[PDB]
Every structure is written in structure tokens, then in C-alpha cells.
Amino acid sequence: MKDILRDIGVIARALDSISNIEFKELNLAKGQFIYLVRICENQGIIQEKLVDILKIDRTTASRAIKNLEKNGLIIKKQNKNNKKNKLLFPTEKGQQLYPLIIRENEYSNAVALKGFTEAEINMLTDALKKVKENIADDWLYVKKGNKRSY
């Protein structure tokens, strides 16, 4: 069985570090861009749903989202039928940053996917989607506190 955890970890460290440095121009912090991007596509969704689809810690997302709302990029309004859910909507400062973030994310994507044909990227989109699903259960299994057996 050949390792894959290493390269995927390397590739993510680079792409995230590039995005952090480039987005510091737009005053976005270390990991704050992954939230607003997802919040802009799915308007009004909840911390717990983002925590699930993004696979980050809940407390880490809580304070990181507190700044995006403090610094005026998103707004957390509540629903009349739910006293606990906080529906996270983007502001006009956030709606204008989304087309720019898509360009850095897409240009970094084109640099990373340089050399692949249209069929090769789909074979890689499917392979990564499968790996993302295979690891989803064990992430919450360890996140809850349960001990793995190996």
C-alpha cells in the first residue's frame, strides 16, 4: 500500500499558504476565506453544517466566524422558528469579495492541474471524492472522542 497522506498534506499546505498570503491583501485572516466562500454559495447555513462539510473543529470555526461577522463580511441572523440556529448570511462586503476569491482559487487550481486533460481531471475529481467519503466516518468517530482500533 503506497502512501498518499504525505502528498495530499503537502499539496494542501502550499495551496492554503498561497491563499493566506494573497488574501491578506483583502484583510482576510489565516483561515477565514474557506468560510465566506462556502457561506456565499449556501446563504444562511449554520456553523454545524459548515463544520461537517469542511471538516474543521467546531470551536475553531466559532471564533473564526466571529471575526467575519465583526469585521463586517457576514451577518448572523436568527430564524423565528429556531431559538438556537444562527443562520449565517454574507454582507455586501462579502458578496463583492466572492468573485475575487474564486479567481485566486481557480488560478491556483489551473496551476495545480497544469498538464492534465479534461478526462484526467475528472478521474481525479472522482478519486478525491471517494477518498473524502472514505475518511468522513472516521473523522467524526475520533472527533466525538471514540478510540480507533488498528
Partner DNA sequence: CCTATTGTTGCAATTGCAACAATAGG
Q: Which does 48 bind (CB under 5 to 8 A by kind): its own copies, DNA, none?
A: DNA
104-109 — which CB contacts under 8 Å span 24+ positions?
A: 104/19, 104/22, 104/23, 105/19, 105/37, 108/15, 108/18, 108/19
What is the dihedral sign for C-alpha 59, 60, 61, 65? positive
Q: Which does 82 bind (CB under 5 to 8 A by kind): DNA, its own copies, none?
A: DNA
Determine the Cα–Cα distance for residues 9 and 86; give it in Å rounded to an integer.
32
Helices (H), the chain: 5-23, 33-41, 47-54, 58-70, 92-112, 118-134, 136-144
Chain mean position to CA 116:
24
Q: Mask of contacts with its own copies, 131-150, x by CB under 8 A?
A: xx-xxx-xx--xx----x-x
Residue 29 binds to its own copies (criterion: CB under 8 A): no
Residue 127 binds to its own copies (criterion: CB under 8 A): yes
Q: Which stretch binds DNA (CB under 7 A): 18-26, 91-99, 105-113, 129-137?
A: 18-26
Residue 85 binds to DNA (criterion: CB under 7 A): yes
Size of the site for DNA (CB under 7 A): 31
Q: Which does 139 bind (CB under 5 to 8 A by kind): DNA, its own copies, none?
A: its own copies
Minimum gap (Å) between residue 136 Cβ and DNA: 14
User: Where along the sequence are the contacts to DNA (CB under 7 A)?
Assistant: 17, 20-21, 24, 29-32, 46-48, 56-60, 62-67, 76, 81-86, 143, 145
